[PDB]
Amino acid sequence: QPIFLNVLEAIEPGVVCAGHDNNQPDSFAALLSSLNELGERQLVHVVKWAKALPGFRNLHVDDQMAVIQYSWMGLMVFAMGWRSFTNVNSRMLYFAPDLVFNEYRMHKSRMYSQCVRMRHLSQEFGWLQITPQEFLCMKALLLFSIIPVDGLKNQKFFDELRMNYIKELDRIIACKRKNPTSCSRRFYQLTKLLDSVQPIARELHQFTFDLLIKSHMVSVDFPEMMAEIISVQVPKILSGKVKPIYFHTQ
Ligand SMILES: C[C@@H](Cc1ccc(O)c(O)c1)[C@@H](C)Cc1ccc(O)c(O)c1
Ligand SMILES: C[C@]12CC[C@H]3[C@@H](CCC4=CC(=O)CC[C@@]43C)[C@@H]1CC[C@@H]2O
C-alpha cells in the first residue's frame, strides 16, 4: 500500500462554493468580485491542505507561509482545470458549482484570453489521460515550484522536500508500466504539463494586480486576504524577486 497516496487522497479539499448571485446580469464587476470571494474561500483550504502534506511542517515556519503565498494561483488554476475536465469535459470553466463560466462569462470577465489558456490546460488532462493519482502528486509538486531568487530561510529543507515530491511522482508513474520508454515519455509529458501552469499563473498575477490597483474605479471588491497577498506578495513575483521553478527552460 502506498502511504504517500493515502495521504494526498485523504487531505484533498472538498467542493468550495463561490457565493455568486447567479440571478444578477453577468457583469465584469460581479463576475470578478465573486472570483475574488472565491479566492479568499479557496485560500483557507489551501492553507489547511498544505499544512497536512507529508514533510511540510519540517520547513521553517516563515517558509511555510511564503510558499503558500507564492504558489496559490498555480495550485488553484490547476485544481480548477481538473474540476473542469471531470465535471463538464472541459467545455466551460468550472470555477465553483455556482460559478461556471460559459463563453459569454469569459468575455464579460474581460479575461477571454486567459480563460482560453486555462481551458487548453483543462483539456490537457483529457488529452494526456491524467489519473487522479498523477493529478494529486502534480498538485503537491506545484506547491513547491516557485521561490525567491535569494532562496528561502532554510533553502536546504525545501530542496529535500521537493526532490521527494519529484520521486513520488516518478513512483506513481512506474507503479504499473511495462518498458522504460513510456515511463520516460510520460515523465517528460507530465513535467511539461506542470511547466505550462506557470505562464498562465503569471498572466493572472498581472491581471489581478492591475485589477486591484483600479479596484475603486471599477467597483470590484477584494476580500482582505486577497488584497494583502496581491499587494504584498504578487508584486515580488511581477518584479522578478520570486520566480517559478521550471523543469525545462522556457
Ligand atoms: C513526502 C515524503 C516521501 C515519503 C515518505 C514516506 C513514505 O512511506 C513514502 O513512500 C514517501 C518525504 C517528505 C520524505 C520525508 C521524510 C522525513 C522528513 O523529515 C521530510 O521532510 C521528508
Ligand atoms: C485572482 C482572481 C480571483 C481568484 C481566481 C483567479 C482565476 C483563477 C482561479 C481559479 C479558482 O478556481 C479559484 C479562484 C482563482 C484563484 C482570478 C483572476 C482575477 C481575479 O482577481
From Swiss-Prot:
UniProt-reported outcome of changing V197M: In AIS and prostate cancer
Outcome recorded upon mutating V220M: In AIS and PAIS
Residues in cross-link Glycyl lysine isopeptide (Lys-Gly) (interchain with G-Cter in ubiquitin): K176, K178
Subunit field text: Binds DNA as a homodimer. Part of a ternary complex containing AR, EFCAB6/DJBP and PARK7. Interacts with HIPK3 and NR0B2 in the presence of androgen. The ligand binding domain interacts with KAT7/HBO1 in the presence of dihydrotestosterone. Interacts with EFCAB6/DJBP, PQBP1, RANBP9, RBAK, SPDEF, SRA1, TGFB1I1 and RREB1. Interacts with ZMIZ1/ZIMP10 and ZMIZ2/ZMIP7 which both enhance its transactivation activity. Interacts with SLC30A9 and RAD54L2/ARIP4. Interacts with MACROD1 (via macro domain).
Disease listed for this protein: Androgen insensitivity syndrome: An X-linked recessive form of pseudohermaphroditism due end-organ resistance to androgen. Affected males have female external genitalia, female breast development, blind vagina, absent uterus and female adnexa, and abdominal or inguinal testes, despite a normal 46,XY karyotype. Spinal and bulbar muscular atrophy X-linked 1: An X-linked recessive form of spinal muscular atrophy. Spinal muscular atrophy refers to a group of neuromuscular disorders characterized by degeneration of the anterior horn cells of the spinal cord, leading to symmetrical muscle weakness and atrophy. SMAX1 occurs only in men. Age at onset is usually in the third to fifth decade of life, but earlier involvement has been reported. It is characterized by slowly progressive limb and bulbar muscle weakness with fasciculations, muscle atrophy, and gynecomastia.
Region ranges (Interaction with CCAR1): 1-249
Organism phylogeny: Eukaryota, Metazoa, Chordata, Craniata, Vertebrata
Region entry Interaction with LPXN, spans: 1-249
Effect of L32A: Alters receptor specificity, so that transcription is activated by the antiandrogen cyproterone acetate
Result when mutating F85L: In PAIS and prostate cancer
Mutation effect (A52T): In prostate cancer; somatic mutation
Effect caused by changing Q1R: In prostate cancer
Family designation: Belongs to the nuclear hormone receptor family. NR3 subfamily.
Functional summary from the UniProt entry: Steroid hormone receptors are ligand-activated transcription factors that regulate eukaryotic gene expression and affect cellular proliferation and differentiation in target tissues. Transcription factor activity is modulated by bound coactivator and corepressor proteins like ZBTB7A that recruits NCOR1 and NCOR2 to the androgen response elements/ARE on target genes, negatively regulating androgen receptor signaling and androgen-induced cell proliferation. Transcription activation is also down-regulated by NR0B2. Activated, but not phosphorylated, by HIPK3 and ZIPK/DAPK3.
Impact after mutating M138V: In AIS; 25% androgen binding
Effect on the protein of changing L238F: In AIS; almost complete loss of transcription activation
Variant or mutagenesis effect after changing A227T: In prostate cancer
Name of this protein: Androgen receptor
Site feature Interaction with coactivator LXXL and FXXFY motifs, where: K51
Comment field on protein domains: Composed of three domains: a modulating N-terminal domain, a DNA-binding domain and a C-terminal ligand-binding domain. In the presence of bound steroid the ligand-binding domain interacts with the N-terminal modulating domain, and thereby activates AR transcription factor activity. Agonist binding is required for dimerization and binding to target DNA. The transcription factor activity of the complex formed by ligand-activated AR and DNA is modulated by interactions with coactivator and corepressor proteins.
Species per Swiss-Prot/TrEMBL record: Homo sapiens (Human)
Impact after mutating Q250R: In prostate cancer
Compartments it resides in: Nucleus; Cytoplasm
Effect listed in the UniProt record for changing T208S: In prostate cancer
Effect of S145N: In AIS and PAIS
Entry-annotated residues carrying Phosphotyrosine: Y246
Note: In the absence of ligand, steroid hormone receptors are thought to be weakly associated with nuclear components; hormone binding greatly increases receptor affinity. The hormone-receptor complex appears to recognize discrete DNA sequences upstream of transcriptional start sites.
